[PDB]
Amino acid sequence: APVRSLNCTLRDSQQKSLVMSGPYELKALHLQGQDMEQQVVFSMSFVQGEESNDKIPVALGLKEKNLYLSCVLKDDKPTLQLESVDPKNYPKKKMEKRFVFNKIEINNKLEFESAQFPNWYISTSQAENMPVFLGGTKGGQDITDWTMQFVSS
DSSP states (O other): OOSEEEEEEEEETTOOEEEEOSTTOEEEEOOOGGGGGGSOOEEEEEOSSOOOSSEEEEEEEETTSSEEEEEEEETTEEEEEEEEOOTTTOSOSSOOGGGEEEEEEOSSOEEEEESSSTTOEEEBOSSTTEEOEEESOSSSSSBOOEEEEEOOO
16 A cells, blocks of 8 residues: 555544534534544544654545545635545645644644644634634643544554
């Protein structure tokens, strides 16, 4: 396989899980029990890029769907979005920059920094059922730390 990938789920530091909002939006909320099945399963691909022992470039797509998280300027500000791609050309080792995130291992958690926009991270709100977004601040009110769970694939 050209590019290596692994399936996983993500949960923020407040233990909120991720679910599909509209066709192109992700939302975070406290889930438990049977509702767990509703959570989004990602296909994390290890792509080409600046690498380090604690910083690894990845692309995040939805498992079995030609939809990838992307970072673009929307209304003069870095913005997170789900982008549709040609199902025949993805995933690939050399992903366009907007699809690339630097997976950073901290204390015992993970942070996902946009390779395109330095110091902007995939974040969630403290509030229930709000969209997952790209935030440019750490240590504030918004959550930027995550944990990852591997799935049977």
